[PDB]
Amino acid sequence: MEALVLVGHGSRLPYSKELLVKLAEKVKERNLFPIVEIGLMEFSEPTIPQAVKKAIEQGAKRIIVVPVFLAHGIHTTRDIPRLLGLIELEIPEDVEIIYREPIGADDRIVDIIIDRAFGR
Amino acid sequence: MEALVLVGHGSRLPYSKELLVKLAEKVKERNLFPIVEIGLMEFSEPTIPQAVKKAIEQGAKRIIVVPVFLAHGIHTTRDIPRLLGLILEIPEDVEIIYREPIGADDRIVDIIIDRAFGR
Numbered sequence: 001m002e003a004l005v006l007v008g009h010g011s012r013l014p015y016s017k018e019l020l021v022k023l024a025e026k027v028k029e030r031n032l033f034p035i036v037e038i039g040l041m042e043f044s045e046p047t048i049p050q051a052v053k054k055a056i057e058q059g060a061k062r063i064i065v066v067p068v069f070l071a072h073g074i075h076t077t078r079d080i081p082r083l084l085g086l087i088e089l090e091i092p093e094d095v096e097i098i099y100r101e102p103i104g105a106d107d108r109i110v111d112i113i114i115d116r117a118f119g120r
Numbered sequence: 121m122e123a124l125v126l127v128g129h130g131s132r133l134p135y136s137k138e139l140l141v142k143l144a145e146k147v148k149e150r151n152l153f154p155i156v157e158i159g160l161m162e163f164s165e166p167t168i169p170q171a172v173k174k175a176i177e178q179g180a181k182r183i184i185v186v187p188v189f190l191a192h193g194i195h196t197t198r199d200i201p202r203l204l205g206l207i208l209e210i211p212e213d214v215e216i217i218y219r220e221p222i223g224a225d226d227r228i229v230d231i232i233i234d235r236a237f238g239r
């Protein structure tokens with residue numbers, strides 16, 4: 001019905017993908033979405049288009065795309081909107097992509113940062 | 121005595137710096153650190169060396185450097201350790217403590233779920 005697609009930067013190193021995979025598995029452990037997939041913008045598979053099509057094939061008509069990025073940048077403003085076809089890959093007409101906001105300066109980020117500062 | 125240095129990627133766009141600024145401000149509001157400074161790896165000021173030097177001159181000898189990055193990558197494993205002189209910059213008898221990134225923290229899941237629902 002509805003799918004969650006977590007999208008991340010990707011890296012020539014393996015850590016960025018590992019992060020998205022672990023995040024997806026935890027979201028799945030929460031039992032909130034019928035369909036959960038990940039896509040990596042560059043260097044690594046699944047790519048963002050592959051994640052969106054896999055989601056569509058599993059039966060999703062509304063696709064929630066969450067940019068797992070701390071801040072807006074060209075990737076969240078230009079490259080990814082592009083891949084998703086939101087700026088001038090095929091999305092069927094009965095399907096809508098809903099592109100969400102990045103993490104930003106969430107109070108919980110401050111909490112994490114302070115934990116890290118103390119080595120926890 | 122001890123300083124907190126928040127380090128971020130930087131971007132040709134202003135949003136990456138704005139993020140670090142807001143985060144530093146919120147940490148400052150918590151009255152946890154005597155010295156709090158931000159530095160940006162590229163494209164923007166303060167640079168990482170400038171943040172560390174500011175901290176040192178304000179009286180810090182222990183500099184907690186926290187990479188405000190989601191995952192390790194070449195920047196957290198190579199570029200930043202080198203700016204910190206961990207592998208332009210000359211420190212002192214002072215210790216830099218280079219901390220860990222955010223990683224797949226449960227609170228990241230919480231934020232992601234909020235974002236999924238437009239919150």
Ligand SMILES: O=C(O)CCC1=C(CC(=O)O)c2cc3[nH]c(cc4nc(cc5[nH]c(cc1n2)c(CC(=O)O)c5CCC(=O)O)C(CCC(=O)O)=C4CC(=O)O)c(CC(=O)O)c3CCC(=O)O
Pocket residue numbers: 009010011012013016068069070071072073074075076129130131132133136188189190191192193194195196
């Ligand atoms: O670094 C490499 O050599 C390969 C991977 C890589 C490249 C590709 C390459 O350079 O060949 C890539 C490219 C860059 N990404 C760049 C920027 C961004 N990378 C960003 C992030 C990353 N670039 C990370 C990695 C990459 N960024 C990687 C992964 C890695 O370390 O390999 C990350 C993710 C870091 C994280 O998880 O926070 C971010 C931040 C996203 C956020 O705020 O969450 C930005 C900010 C923006 O989009 O303007 C930019 C800067 C720019 O032109 O604006 C560029 C060109 C300069 C650079 O290598 O740093």
